[PDB]
Amino acid sequence: LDFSGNKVFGKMVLDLRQSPPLLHGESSFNADRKIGHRPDLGDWQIREKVGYANSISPYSSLAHGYANSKWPRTIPKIPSGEYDTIILGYGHQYQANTEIEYLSNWIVWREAVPDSTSRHKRPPLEVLNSQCTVIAGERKTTVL
């Protein structure tokens, strides 16, 4: 099995004692620089907590996926079976941070990456920590 294609997913710690391997990892996340980051808030709640539009505005004109953009869809399921060699890679947990962009051509409110020339801002993306760990059972294991 190969999960090297996880450039936006770090901390792949997985247990292989049982046939269905138990995989856990922390996904890249997008935050909001107004009051905090609550993944369990929907688009309407984030919009209310930020204040870029109103609840009467159509959903098409609102910011789709603000402060809750989880591009890594939880954790893909590894089918149970026998494992001989595993191909590792390099994965990171990306911090996404954007501000409000007022697009007049569509009267919409979208996300804009911070600009260093506009006063003092934060980098558009960064990596928190860089580490991965695997536990292999009492069989023939190969890691690369």
Side-chain angles (χ1 to χ4, degrees):
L1 85 84
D2 189 358
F3 57 93
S4 64
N6 63 6
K7 302 295 187 291
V8 295
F9 215 140
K11 267 67 182 168
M12 322 334 299
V13 297
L14 72 164
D15 193 326
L16 314 178
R17 304 311 161 271
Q18 67 285 341
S19 179
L22 191 146
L23 178 54
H24 151 286
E26 198 279 333
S27 302
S28 300
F29 44 100
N30 194 333
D32 173 59
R33 287 90 56 82
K34 297 294 296 182
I35 49 182
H37 177 256
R38 271 86 70 192
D40 298 328
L41 292 176
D43 301 1
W44 307 92
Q45 284 79 15
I46 296 299
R47 173 192 50 79
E48 291 176 353
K49 91 170 194 180
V50 170
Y52 58 85
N54 303 330
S55 180
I56 61 180
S57 301
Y59 181 76
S60 301
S61 61
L62 301 183
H64 295 68
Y66 203 104
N68 46 15
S69 302
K70 310 316 155 208
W71 326 266
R73 188 184 60 88
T74 318
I75 290 176
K77 172 56 183 178
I78 304 168
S80 60
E82 70 298 344
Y83 312 99
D84 52 329
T85 195
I86 319 298
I87 317 85
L88 271 295
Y90 296 94
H92 305 271
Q93 60 274 18
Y94 278 170
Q95 177 61 77
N97 45 1
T98 49
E99 70 271 15
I100 298 297
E101 184 178 3
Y102 182 76
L103 295 183
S104 60
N105 48 15
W106 280 128
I107 212 67
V108 289
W109 299 261
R110 308 278 141 170
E111 300 83 7
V113 300
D115 192 9
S116 60
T117 62
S118 60
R119 306 182 298 103
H120 47 72
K121 296 296 289 184
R122 280 79 62 195
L125 73 164
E126 62 89 18
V127 178
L128 294 175
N129 185 22
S130 182
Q131 180 183 182
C132 179
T133 300
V134 63
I135 47 168
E138 81 305 345
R139 60 179 302 181
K140 151 35 51 176
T141 88
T142 304
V143 47
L144 60 86

